[PDB]
């Protein structure tokens, strides 16, 4: 079955500017500006109402209709990123060797870098380079905690996943060795 | 097994005592307690081989009760 018309709607707050040109969405708000190329999905954008974006597919199959939900959630996440931001709080715990985490800003690349030392007594220094736009802060309120803040949910969550996956225990019982860095809390900055 | 009574393919096969499918053999049934009407022990009874021993590695038979 091919459905003749299928539509989704996105409400837009007052402080958001959305510019779509050849399926390239540019969302700018108080915190910053994000861009995303959605040209790989056949979709027609329109202004159905004031502050309302309309997404429509004509003569599409069920897969083509279902793709609009992904596009809707992507644009909504961009709007939430430029309005409230995204914040991932991570906690690093240890049993015997205290894990040392250093955060600096590589200014030549314009991006933050995290150096992890003494992970279960290893002499190697693990290094994680952040995606641009993600800011790393060692939390002063709680103990042994990083905070990743940004406008791009994909960038912040991918940086968090990189920090988890660079600290993995190998050739040991994971029931006994609980060392590592884990994402404790996910939420919005504001 | 007490004797080979009939190999249906050839009387020479019965003379040689070949155990194949459909062969009538004579077995000692002393461990089954088959008794005559006055108390005599029936210790010999015919049975038929119901498998292919040359392909199975064992002889399986059914009593002719």
């Amino acid at each position: 079955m091919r459905y003749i018309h299928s539509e989704e709607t996105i409400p837009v707050p007052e402080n958001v500017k959305v510019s779509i040109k050849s399926r390239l969405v540019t969302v700018e708000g108080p915190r910053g500006k994000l861009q995303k190329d959605l040209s790989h999905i056949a979709v027609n954008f329109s202004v159905v109402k004031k502050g309302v974006i309309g997404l429509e597919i004509h003569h599409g199959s069920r897969k083509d209709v279902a793709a609009l939900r992904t596009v809707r959630t992507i644009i909504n996440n961009m709007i939430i990123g430029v309005t409230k931001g995204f914040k991932y709080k991570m906690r690093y715990v240890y049993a015997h060797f205290p894990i040392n985490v250093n955060v600096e800003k590589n200014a030549e690349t314009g991006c933050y870098e995290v150096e992890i030392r003494n992970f279960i007594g290893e002499k190697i220094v693990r290094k994680v380079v952040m995606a641009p736009g993600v800011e790393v802060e060692i939390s002063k309120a709680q103990k042994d905690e990083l905070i990743l803040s940004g406008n791009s949910l994909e960038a912040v969550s991918q940086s968090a996943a990189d920090i988890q996956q660079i600290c993995k225990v190998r050739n040991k019982d994971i029931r006994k060795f609980l060392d590592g860095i884990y994402v404790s809390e996910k939420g919005n900055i504001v | 097994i007490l004797s080979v009574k009939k190999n249906p393919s050839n009387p020479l096969y019965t003379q040689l005592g070949v155990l194949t499918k459909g062969t009538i053999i004579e077995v000692n049934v002393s461990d089954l307690g088959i008794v005559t009407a006055s108390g005599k022990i029936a210790w010999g009874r015919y049975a038929q081989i119901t498998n292919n021993p040359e392909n199975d590695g064992c002889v399986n038979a059914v009593l002719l009760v």
Binding site: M1, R2, Y3, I4, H5, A42, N44, H58, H59 | -
Partner: protein, 174 residues
């Protein structure tokens, strides 16, 4: 199954001394021509009654033309078809302009979707859905919707196959 036409085929058993006036049997048959129409009549009549071609006669064959071929109609077709499992019912609907067009579309659709040929499809009933709420399948429930207006995105322009080379890249917006 070709350019089909609908035929009223009336036949009967041959009159004998026992039965001077045998009963007449009438069927509506979708067939490409009158020979196929009479053959299908004798096949279906052998399937129901003690009449065959050697013991019966074809009284009448008349083409049943559509009353309003310029009126767009919705048709419900109830049919049985033969598969490797057995006989199965299907009810389908087709939005066409005539019964013969609906039956041709049904034959093409059943061939495409279930690999059923003309030899293994029996047409039991073809009806016109006179009201909109009689429409049950969603693909025509979406066509009978109020104020149905849609565009035609990505229309490849009709370019002649004998003109091999073009000087500009074609547009797909007209």
């Amino acid at each position: 199954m070709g350019r089909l036409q609908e035929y009223q085929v009336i036949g009967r058993h041959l009159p004998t001394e026992a039965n001077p006036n045998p009963a007449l049997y009438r069927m509506r048959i979708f067939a490409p021509n009158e020979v196929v129409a009479k053959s299908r009549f004798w096949y279906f009549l052998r399937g129901l009654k003690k009449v065959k071609k050697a013991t019966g006669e074809i009284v009448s064959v008349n083409v049943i033309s559509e009353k309003h071929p310029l009126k767009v109609k919705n048709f419900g077709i109830w049919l049985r078809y033969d598969s490797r499992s057995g006989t199965h019912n299907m009810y389908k609907e087709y939005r066409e302009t005539s019964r013969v067009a609906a039956v041709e579309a049904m034959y093409a659709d059943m061939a495409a979707r279930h690999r059923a040929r003309f030899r293994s499809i029996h047409i039991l009933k073809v009806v016109e859905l006179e009201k909109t709420e009689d429409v049950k399948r969603p693909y025509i429930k979406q066509l009978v919707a109020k104020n149905l207006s849609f565009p035609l995105p990505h229309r490849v322009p009709k370019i002649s196959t004998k003109k091999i080379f073009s000087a500009k890249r074609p547009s797909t917006f007209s």
